[PDB]
Design a protein around this ligand. Structure first.
Ligand code: NAG
Ligand code: NAG
Ligand code: NAG
Ligand code: NAG
Ligand code: ZN
Lengths: 597, 194
């Protein structure tokens, strides 16, 4: 008769309705993804509209339950996840305006195209031409042109749209009793009403700043080494003490440094490990790759994939008569239906992507016993971390030797180890300053600490101070360079990648300590270790029913983020850079710019 | 001295819903559960009180065969001393159960493309059922204290949910046909043994 029993009954009804409706929506979307037509899009949109209308009705019904009289933590969490009105808290015209702004920004980004006046008739979009130019070209002028042209084409059109988006999102958040939209975002890590495991929304700011202060020396050494190699490659465009130009970071924005491996290889005469030829020789197909991934995953005591996974998932390119958008994704359609939709080629990259998606599917299978609203990671950074740790374990030469893909006569020495470590650091350590800078800028903008007449100025000085990347051309306030990124213009949070990077190394070090791995961390493997598998599953099957701090403690013993595992992972590379940079400078100055003459 | 009609309860083209399970009274015949045990097509046969081979050379007064369809994760609730939705609000089995349940996956028959919603289960109720009790009433369940006179509204909703059975559902969500055999002893003479 109390509010607790009524809320319990309401949630029990909502679970058994939303499960079926979301399952139908996901089934329609999957039927669209394996067989793309126009009627398939119509069916998918109809199912999604039904699901969204039902969710809106249920949120409206849930809003009439006072959370102040709710005692159970799980019921409170479900009611709080359901009571998020979101865009409905504003008026109708303002909501339509916000949706129009969002769609306009998405379209401006996805349909952007820019090219020099040499021939305004032929030029490619971002995805197929500009990404290729940013990754593979080594010409300073071409990369600078592509960078500046994409900026002037996208940010100049997104600036007023993004300002109106910012003020509308601030109004939406302040209507929801939040300080700003950045606070609404940070609410993903906020834990309340639980003693010892609580977490505020400024505690995340402090933890991120502290972890980055700890990271700064390793990233500084890596930045110095990359700058030295690039000045050896670009003799007349890099300063000995200056920052790194933005258009020379291997991609359109500099998010990752993966494409700088060819220019920054430590030992070019030593070929990196690549087992695609051994897979071709031993007649390995997609089925064999996924079977080996399943064998690896069950070696650590995790259950194998169900029959429905093998019967329903699309593991190969379905010919050419029918098209399919086969970007590798792990499908959790609900009601026990897990699938992987991926065009699997016989390569090592796809061999690791299979392990990543199987880790996602295992994490999905772990918390299937949780209620519908509690079927997700502990926060927005646990899924990808659990996915990345499995690929890390599979990428070691020891595992390749065990599965036969590497001959026993392979001589693992310090040179291949340093090469692999530097590749992993370009992939991983290079993105943390960029991610932290971008999220800090977005937070400060949403908090009003940055006026409109200083957006780009503060953004670029934060770049110079934190990331160590100086813009190649001077940008005034008419630009909206941050909006050029996909995750920014499409209203997506960005700190999840920082938390993913930290949590994956925390999990890896914890499991390697549980597996009694002796030696460096970059040579660790969790295979044939049921102890670490059980330690991981203990956090996997939690879902988001418990505070993410408790889920983290369940594996690493700590109640907060820890950066010591990352340094323990990269310490051989760190000593290598400390020995290599003794005859060079380590750091950067903000005064130098590529346009200073 | 005729065979008991086990085919009509095992090989029926349709099965009753779990909230409206049908009970068949089988008597005045002969029965051989050996083929039922050695069929090896059933995924669940678990009971305490009689062994599957010892119940053959042992007969009672009357037997009851209850049939219905549930999920895959919900099969365990059909057992003595169990709780949950089906154990409380749909199918209550006493602790002194002298028989056990026969379950088998039926994703090919009871599930079609789009979802087979012909099977319903009672989700909410004012109290738990008694052993072998059945409630078919469809009165709107009141969750709060204000009356609503049997209409969809706040804290009022229809107390029956339809099972969504697709052919591509998980093993825990595929339609599992459950046949429950209950045995009892009274002063009536033995009718079914051979
Ligand atoms: C793909 O969709 C088209 C049109 O919706 C349909 O005719 C075709 O049969 C579908 N493919 C398969 C394999 O069912
Ligand atoms: C919350 O409700 C669930 C429902 O069964 C129960 O198991 C759990 O013990 C409850 N928690 C508290 C703190 O009452
Ligand atoms: C795991 O152990 C088994 C048996 O000792 C062995 O055959 C297999 O190669 C091992 N795999 C790994 C990855 O160590
Ligand atoms: C149901 O039909 C199958 C197939 O003919 C048969 O094997 C089985 O014995 C029948 N069931 C019973 C209880 O006889
Ligand atoms: Zn992933």
């Amino acid at each position: 008769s109390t509010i607790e029993e009524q809320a319990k009954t309401f949630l029990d009804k909502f679970n058994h309705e939303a499960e079926d409706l979301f399952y139908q929506s996901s089934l329609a979307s999957w039927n669209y993804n394996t067989n793309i037509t126009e009627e398939n899009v119509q069916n998918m949109n109809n199912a999604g509209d039904k699901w969204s209308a039902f969710l809106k009705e249920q949120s409206t019904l849930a809003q009439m339950y006072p959370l102040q009289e709710i005692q159970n933590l799980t019921v409170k969490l479900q009611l709080q996840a359901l009571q998020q009105n979101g865009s409905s808290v504003l008026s109708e015209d303002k909501s339509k305006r916000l949706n129009t702004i969002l769609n306009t920004m998405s379209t401006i980004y996805s349909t952007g195209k820019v090219c020099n006046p040499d021939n305004p008739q032929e030029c490619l979009l971002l995805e197929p031409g500009l990404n290729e130019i940013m990754a593979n070209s080594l010409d300073y002028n071409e990369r600078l042109w592509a960078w500046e042209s994409w900026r002037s084409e996208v940010g100049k059109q997104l600036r007023p749209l993004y300002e109106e988006y910012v003020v509308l999102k601030n109004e939406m958040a302040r209507a929801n009793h939040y300080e700003d939209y950045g606070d609404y975002w940070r609410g993903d890590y906020e834990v309340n009403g639980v003693d010892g495991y609580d977490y505020s929304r400024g505690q995340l700011i402090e933890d991120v700043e502290h972890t980055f202060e700890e990271i700064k020396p390793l990233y500084e050494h890596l930045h110095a080494y990359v700058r030295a190699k690039l000045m050896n490659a670009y003799p007349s465009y890099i300063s000995p003490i200056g920052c790194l130009p933005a258009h020379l970071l291997g991609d359109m924005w500099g998010r990752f440094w993966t494409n700088l491996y060819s220019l920054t290889v430590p030992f070019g005469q030593k070929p990196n490990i690549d087992v695609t030829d051994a897979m071709v020789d031993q007649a390995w197909d997609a089925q064999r790759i996924f079977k080996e991934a399943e064998k690896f995953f069950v070696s650590v005591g995790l259950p194998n994939m169900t029959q429905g996974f093998w019967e329903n998932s699309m593991l190969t390119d379905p010919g050419n008569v029918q098209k399919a958008v086969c970007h590798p994704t792990a499908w959790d359609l609900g009601k026990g239906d897990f699938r992987i939709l991926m065009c699997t080629k016989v390569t090592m990259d796809d061999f690791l992507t299979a392990h990543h998606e199987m880790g996602h599917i295992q994490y999905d299978m772990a918390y299937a016993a949780q209620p519908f609203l509690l079927r997700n990671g502990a926060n927005e950074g646990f899924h990808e971390a659990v996915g990345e740790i499995m690929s890390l374990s599979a990428a070691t030469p020891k595992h390749l030797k065990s599965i036969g893909l590497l001959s026993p006569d392979f001589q693992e020495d310090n040179e291949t180890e340093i090469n692999f470590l530097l590749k992993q650091a370009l992939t991983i350590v290079g993105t943390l300053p960029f991610t932290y800078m971008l999220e800090k800028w977005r937070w400060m903008v949403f908090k009003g600490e940055i006026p409109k007449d200083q957006w780009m100025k503060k953004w670029w000085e934060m770049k110079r101070e934190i990331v160590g990347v100086v813009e190649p051309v001077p940008h005034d306030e008419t630009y909206c360079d941050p909006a050029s990124l996909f995750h920014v213009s499409n209203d997506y949070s960005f700190i999840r990648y920082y938390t993913r990077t930290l949590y994956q190394f925390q999990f890896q070090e914890a499991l390697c300590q549980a597996a009694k791995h002796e030696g460096p961390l970059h040579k660790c493997d969790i295979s044939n270790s049921t102890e670490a598998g059980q330690k991981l599953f203990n956090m996997l099957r939690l879902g988001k029913s418990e505070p993410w701090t408790l889920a983290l403690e369940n594996v690493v013993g700590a109640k907060n983020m820890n950066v010591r595992p990352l340094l323990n992972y990269f310490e051989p590379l760190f000593t290598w850079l400390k020995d290599q940079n003794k005859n060079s400078f380590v750091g950067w100055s903000t005064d130098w710019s590529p346009y200073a003459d | 001295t005729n065979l008991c009609p086990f085919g009509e309860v095992f090989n029926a083209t349709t099965f009753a819903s779990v909230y409206a399970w049908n009970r068949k009274r089988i008597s005045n015949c002969v029965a051989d559960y050996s083929v039922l045990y050695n069929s090896t097509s059933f995924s669940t046969f678990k009971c305490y009180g009689v062994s599957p081979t010892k119940l053959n050379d042992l007969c009672f007064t009357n037997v009851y065969a209850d049939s219905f369809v549930v999920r895959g994760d919900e099969v365990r609730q059909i057992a003595p001393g169990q709780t949950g939705r089906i154990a409380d609000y749909n199918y209550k089995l006493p602790d002194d159960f002298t028989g056990c349940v026969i379950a088998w996956n039926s994703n090919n028959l009871d599930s079609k493309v789009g979802g087979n919603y012909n099977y319903l289960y009672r989700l909410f109720r004012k109290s738990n059922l008694k052993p072998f009790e059945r409630d078919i009433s469809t009165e709107i369940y009141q969750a709060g204290s204000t009356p609503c006179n049997g209409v969809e509204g706040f804290n009022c909703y229809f107390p029956l949910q339809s099972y969504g059975f697709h052919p591509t559902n998980g093993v825990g969500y595929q339609p599992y046909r459950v046949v429950v055999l209950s045995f009892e002893l009274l002063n009536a003479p033995a009718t079914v043994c051979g």
